[PDB]
Amino acid sequence: KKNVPHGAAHIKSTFNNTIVTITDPQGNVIAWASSGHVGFKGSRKSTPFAAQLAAENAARKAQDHGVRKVDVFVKGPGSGRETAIRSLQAAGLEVGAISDVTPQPHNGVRPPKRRRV
Amino acid sequence: PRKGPAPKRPLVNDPVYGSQLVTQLVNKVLLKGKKSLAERIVYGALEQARDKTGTDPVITLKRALDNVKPALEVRSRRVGGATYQVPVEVRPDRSTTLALRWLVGYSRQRREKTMIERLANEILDASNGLGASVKRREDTHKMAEANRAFAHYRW
RNA sequence: ACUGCAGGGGAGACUGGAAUUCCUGGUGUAGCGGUGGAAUGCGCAGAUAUCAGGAGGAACACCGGUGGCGAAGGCGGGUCUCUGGGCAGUAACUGACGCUGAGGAGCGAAAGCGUGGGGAGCGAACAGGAUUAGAUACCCUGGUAGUCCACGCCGUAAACGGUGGGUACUAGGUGUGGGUUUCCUUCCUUGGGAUCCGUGCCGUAGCUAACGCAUUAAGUACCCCGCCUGGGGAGUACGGCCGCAAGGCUAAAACUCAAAGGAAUUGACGGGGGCCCGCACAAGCGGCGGAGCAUGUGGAUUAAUUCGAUGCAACGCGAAGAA
Ligand SMILES: [Mg+2]
Ligand SMILES: [Mg+2]
Ligand SMILES: [Mg+2]
Ligand SMILES: [Mg+2]
Ligand SMILES: [Mg+2]
Ligand SMILES: [Mg+2]
Ligand SMILES: [Mg+2]
Ligand SMILES: [Mg+2]
Ligand SMILES: [Mg+2]
Ligand SMILES: [Mg+2]
Ligand SMILES: [Mg+2]
Ligand SMILES: [Mg+2]
Ligand SMILES: [Mg+2]
Ligand SMILES: [Mg+2]
Ligand SMILES: [Mg+2]
Ligand SMILES: [Mg+2]
Ligand SMILES: [Mg+2]
Ligand SMILES: [Mg+2]
Ligand SMILES: [Mg+2]
Ligand SMILES: [Mg+2]
Ligand SMILES: [Mg+2]
Ligand SMILES: [Mg+2]
Ligand SMILES: [Mg+2]
Ligand SMILES: [Mg+2]
Ligand SMILES: [Mg+2]
Ligand SMILES: [Mg+2]
Ligand SMILES: [Mg+2]
Ligand SMILES: [Mg+2]
Ligand SMILES: [Mg+2]
Ligand SMILES: [Mg+2]
Ligand SMILES: [Mg+2]
Ligand SMILES: [Mg+2]
Ligand SMILES: [Mg+2]
């Protein structure tokens, strides 16, 4: 029963998965439908096709709560970073501003050991 | 091959029916060089086709093909430790080729007596959308609509 | 000595922000995580995600470079305190006070060890999952010591420029870091010329087995120290000294082999790279492998089954004629 006309869509896109949650500007979550909610399992979640269905499922489920305009905050080094933004435009939403909030440490904590694959 | 495309072969118009589609059907029925035998099946099955509809049979034949042309096929590729299918677009002159192989191919294992009446049933059960060659259209598409995740590997 | 100048040289104390994790609440609902592909695992008892506050530890994005500094090891978030060395100019001062240095003494990455703190993340040992003939590994989820701090010990590294320290001389070309000074000097250009000390690149004479070195020598010379004398046995044994221990330093012989080696050359090869081709694959059509029979072979049998052919490139082959 929550009603808000202006929102804020957050997108996290890793090498394994994408998650599209949509909040109000105060930061409270409305709808969050990701790439495992849309039916996929395993390495298929990282594909760009699985990102343009996760962004459709979070968009229609947010327009039922009255969201007509979002702000986009992508982060993560994923391949579903651009196809998720174009998926929000072909669902009835307006994108407004697209930002970049990928966390950048100032050489803080130690990364794991490099893979000898 | 290695050195580009090879020049494809022309097809002359069929003398009985003024269309290149009938003379492309007789070459899928053709076995062992018996071309006059393969022309007595295709001319025979089309005359049997007009005795159950009354419509001209090369108009019946094109509606039999428009329900079995695939739009997406499912060509395979090995990527890493697991191989998986890839959906690619079918060009138009392959969609004619891959459909006429399916009318002749599923009529040879249909339950009638002669080839003239086995072929004339599969054309009429595809002009209505009910045959077994039509079912392979919505099995090729279902395997191509369950693999849109792999469309970014187009060789 | 005096005047200048550059610097992550060291030590102590205080201190700043991003990020990781956890905790406490808000919203929200079924997945998240992970891989070549999965699974163990986390979650549905409210996770991942998103916002706000709070706790703690460790490393310091951009500047950052081909660069600076230090005897080497090594050294960078900011600030204050204390402190070592270097370079240029003046030529005020002492008047050979210099160089090297057996033994010796100090410093000395990382791992490790002692007592006491701290412990975010990472992570030997460990455990489970997957892979596989096996997998005590690679890959994944976890995870203890340790990594961090204080005071001691250890004293080893491919501790490397695989090149001991001082000095003198021997064509240059061209970058960059720290000075001083002359000419168009106010034409500003922070360009050009000269000189002193770093640091790289390419090059002549000369040297070298060759690769290469080449005013930062591996060139031409002189002074001092260390070290080598075929490869294994072996930086091992015994003895000694040091160490809390792990272990370090000094250091053999018997025996055994006729070699072990260094650079370059030609080829072959690679689950190295570039380009290119073949019914190689793909896209198709028809077969073989199953059945009866013909023909050749292996084997077996026989008085004899004449002999030859035996991955491709032997097996309807020599045999285009065995009653
Ligand atoms: Mg300092
Ligand atoms: Mg913080
Ligand atoms: Mg914690
Ligand atoms: Mg919460
Ligand atoms: Mg959270
Ligand atoms: Mg400091
Ligand atoms: Mg005097
Ligand atoms: Mg000395
Ligand atoms: Mg240590
Ligand atoms: Mg121990
Ligand atoms: Mg300790
Ligand atoms: Mg302790
Ligand atoms: Mg194990
Ligand atoms: Mg591990
Ligand atoms: Mg201290
Ligand atoms: Mg010591
Ligand atoms: Mg040594
Ligand atoms: Mg070193
Ligand atoms: Mg040495
Ligand atoms: Mg010398
Ligand atoms: Mg000296
Ligand atoms: Mg110089
Ligand atoms: Mg050179
Ligand atoms: Mg030499
Ligand atoms: Mg010897
Ligand atoms: Mg020893
Ligand atoms: Mg001993
Ligand atoms: Mg060699
Ligand atoms: Mg090759
Ligand atoms: Mg093939
Ligand atoms: Mg057979
Ligand atoms: Mg024989
Ligand atoms: Mg033959």
Distances B91 to B20, B88, B94, B98, B135 between C-alpha atoms, Å: 18, 9, 6, 11, 21
What contacts B67, CB < 8 A, 6 or more positions away? B126, B127, B129, B134, B137
Cα B82 to ligand 27 centroid, rounded to whole Å:
59
Tell whether B146 lies on the interface with A, counting CB pairs under 8 A.
no
C-beta atoms surrounding B24 within 10 Å? 14
CA–CA dist A53, A88 (Å, integer): 10
| Resolution value (Å, 1 decimal) | 2.8
**Which SS3 state, helix, strand or coil, does residue B13 take?**
coil
Closest protein residue to C20 using CA and C1' atoms? Answer: A109
- Would an 8 Å CB–CB cutoff place A82 in contact with chain B? no
Q: Quote the tokens at residue A55.
A: 């962004």
State the amino acid at position B121 in one-letter form: N
The whole-angstrom distance between residue B51's C-alpha and the CA centroid of its chain comes to 23
From the list B61, B144, B60, B138, the residue with the least C-alpha distance to B104 is B61
C-beta of residue A76 within 8 angstroms of C-beta of residue A50: no
Cα separation of B33 and B35, whole Å? 6
C1' (C130) to CA (A117) span, angstroms: 15
CB-based contact B76:B144 (threshold 8 Å): no
Q: How far is CA B93 from the centre of its chain?
A: 11
> How far apart (Å, rounded) are the C-alpha atoms in residues B7 and A103?
57
Residue with tokens 């495309």: B5
- C-alpha A109 to ligand 3 mean position (Å): 14
Calpha distance A71→A22 (Å, rounded) = 9
This structure was determined by cryo-EM
Tokens 């399992």 belong to residue: A41
Helix (H, G, I), strand (E, B) or coil at A72: strand
Asked if the C-beta of B147 comes within 8 angstroms of chain A's C-beta atoms, the answer is: no
- Rounded to 10 degrees, the C-alpha dihedral B143/B145/B150/B155 comes to 70
Half-sphere exposure at residue B68, Cβ-oriented, CA atoms within 13 angstroms: 31
CA of B34 to C1' of C321 (A): 38
CA–CA dist A80, B128 (Å, integer): 43
Question: Tokens 């174009």 identify what position?
Answer: A86
Those residues with Cβ within 8 angstroms of residue A17's Cβ, 6 or more apart along the chain or in another chain = A34, A35, A36, A45, A46
Token readout for B138 is: 């919505």
Phi, psi of A10 (to 5 degrees): -110, 135
> Given an 8 Å threshold on Cβ–Cβ distance, is A40 in contact with B149?
yes
Three-class SS of residue B76? strand
Distance CA B57, CA A61 (A): 51
CA-CA distance, A73 to A23, in Å (whole number)? 11
A77-CA/C200-C1' distance, Å? 38
CB A4: neighbour CB atoms within 10 A?
16
Is A40 an 8 Å CB contact of chain B?
yes
Give A72's strand partners: A9, A98
Query: Closest residue of A to B149, CA-based?
Result: A49
Nucleotides of C under 7 A from a protein CB: 17-20, 26-39, 48-52, 57-61, 120-123, 138-140, 276-286
Tokens describing residue B146: 């369950």
